[PDB]
Design a protein around this ligand. Sequence first.
Ligand SMILES: O=C1N[C@H](c2c(CNCCCCCCNCc3[nH]c4ccccc4c3[C@H]3NC(=O)c4ccc(O)cc43)[nH]c3ccccc23)c2cc(O)ccc21
Ligand SMILES: Nc1nc2c(ncn2[C@@H]2O[C@H](COP(=O)(O)OP(=O)(O)CP(=O)(O)O)[C@@H](O)[C@H]2O)c(=O)[nH]1
Ligand SMILES: Nc1nc2c(ncn2[C@@H]2O[C@H](COP(=O)(O)OP(=O)(O)CP(=O)(O)O)[C@@H](O)[C@H]2O)c(=O)[nH]1
Ligand SMILES: [Mg+2]
Ligand SMILES: [Mg+2]
Lengths: 167, 167
Amino acid sequence: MTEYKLVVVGADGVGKSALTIQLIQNHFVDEYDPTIEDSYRKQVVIDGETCLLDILDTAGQEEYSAMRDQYMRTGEGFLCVFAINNTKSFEDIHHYREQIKRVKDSEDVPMVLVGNKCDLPSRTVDTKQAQDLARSYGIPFIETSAKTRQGVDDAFYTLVREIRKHK
Amino acid sequence: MTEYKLVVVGADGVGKSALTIQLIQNHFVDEYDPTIEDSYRKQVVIDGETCLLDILDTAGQEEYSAMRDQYMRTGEGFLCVFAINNTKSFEDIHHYREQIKRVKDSEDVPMVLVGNKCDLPSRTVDTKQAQDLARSYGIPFIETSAKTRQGVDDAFYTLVREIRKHK
Ligand SMILES: O=C1N[C@H](c2c(CNCCCCCCNCc3[nH]c4ccccc4c3[C@H]3NC(=O)c4ccc(O)cc43)[nH]c3ccccc23)c2cc(O)ccc21
Ligand SMILES: Nc1nc2c(ncn2[C@@H]2O[C@H](COP(=O)(O)OP(=O)(O)CP(=O)(O)O)[C@@H](O)[C@H]2O)c(=O)[nH]1
Ligand SMILES: Nc1nc2c(ncn2[C@@H]2O[C@H](COP(=O)(O)OP(=O)(O)CP(=O)(O)O)[C@@H](O)[C@H]2O)c(=O)[nH]1
Ligand SMILES: [Mg+2]
Ligand SMILES: [Mg+2]
């Protein structure tokens, strides 16, 4: 058995909690209830290895920069989430990646860029634009929908694979 | 901590959803997606008190006005929204205010008159005209733009202050 500390980060309302709740509880959260900080455990098998995922579901906006830095130091891998209908959340990605790199004092940190709400037709961030950004960061990119469950398992499992590769 | 049940009402397309989404998610929705009924939570500090805002984003549908009675009974305060480029929506305000007063069986219901889309130069409702009407209603008036965020926080916070005053 191996434990993996995963952190889900991103702007207000991108679907951080809905993505995590889909992985843990296998259903969609339709309601909008802002997160302060929650954590969840999930035991899963990834590439034949027994994994205990310890997932931190973070707030869109931190109250204390120093409190935020602590989970970035502890976290082994980061799911950097934006919503495909929210250009501000996509532009905010750089700020999350820069904060993670600074706290970890490393240019190489396991990360996955997640483009959530891909079920929505009202797209403002194109697929190629997110693919190019992820290519420039040297990280995988996955489109997800916490509503339909599209790409949810793949986003978390890819992050675990990135952590296992880094180790 | 205190919870406040806020209701955003007004005619079709005045920007009820865009105002609420700007308040909580800090981005402007350019798309027009008609609302059936959505609710959102937002934790804020107003005059030193932590407020958990429970905001109901309602439909602009003019048909079956009786469908509004239950949320009008439950709601503690109302954001009565019109668009500054839509004279019909400004004239419709009276119908929303009359229904609220009837359902609540009170002339002193916490309300704020909101003149949305103030970023638009194609104005048909003058600021002074809405100020004059709001004064005759005995309620505050705030101009807002879900696009620029002008007056968005002030509209919701003023409504909370009106509910507190009423208590
Ligand atoms: O004040 C505190 N609240 C905290 C707390 C919570 C968390 N709550 C989170 C919001 C929950 C929204 C629930 C959907 N609320 C949805 C909602 N939002 C509205 C806004 C306006 C009008 C109606 C609604 C409605 C709907 N409700 C109706 O009756 C209705 C009718 C017609 C409609 O069409 C729509 C609606 N749960 C607790 C249980 C016990 C004690 C405290 C709490 C708390 C903790 C604490 O340490 C100290 C103080 C507090
Ligand atoms: N259409 C659609 N809606 C989604 C998707 N993911 C989340 N949502 C919706 O977006 C809203 C916010 O989702 P939530 O998971 O709370 O986002 P969050 O980023 O955790 C909010 P906070 O930053 O305050 O913790 C909810 O109404 C939820 O149903 C998705 O993939 N598609
Ligand atoms: N320029 C400008 N456009 C706005 C503003 N607020 C809303 N809009 C635009 O008006 C249209 C309708 O916005 P929306 O928030 O859906 O209005 P609504 O009142 O919730 C519509 P419904 O009654 O069906 O729920 C959208 O195209 C939106 O971009 C604003 O402050 N400025
Ligand atoms: Mg959340
Ligand atoms: Mg709407």
